[model samples]
Target: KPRVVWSVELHQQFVAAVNQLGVEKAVPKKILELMNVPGLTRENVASHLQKYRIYLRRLGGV
Candidate 1:
């Protein structure tokens, strides 16, 4: 089984995907498709997205 590590590469891919689509369209499913990375899943993107939302909230929203 392949474990997903939160490496710089994965982080960049997620960021790029989000930036490409903008917030409204950047859902987990869409992000997963845009990433096109092997072993990456929608749940993985969702977790990352959740963290980002928390981050934005910390900064008084994005």
Candidate 2:
């Protein structure tokens, strides 16, 4: 499979979806559905979500 690039606009949509679902409650499958982007897939969101949670931890640490 080809690599997916996460653009700023797309990431924003992801953040919004996560926020709506509540971070801990959000799952890759649900996130993919919420994003509704043509080429996006569950694996893409899953990886991004993994990174996002790390970012969230850093922010929360402050």
lDDT agreement with native, every candidate: 0.82, 0.88
- lDDT per residue for candidate 1 within 1-62, as digits (tens), equals 67678889888888888889986568998888888997777787788898877886778746
Instruction: Provide the lowest-lDDT 10-residue window in model 1.
Output: 53-62
Residue 6 in model 2: shift from native, Å? 1.0
Q: Mark the regions of model 1 whose C-alpha exceeds 4 Å error after superposition.
A: none
* Deviation from native of the Cα of residue 4 in model 1, angstroms: 2.1
Question: Candidate 1, 55: how far from true, in Å?
Answer: 1.1
Candidate with the greatest TM-score versus the true structure: 2
Provide TM-scores for the models. 0.80, 0.88
Q: For this target, which candidate reaches the highest lDDT against the unseen true structure?
A: 2
| TM-score for candidate 1, residues paired by index | 0.80
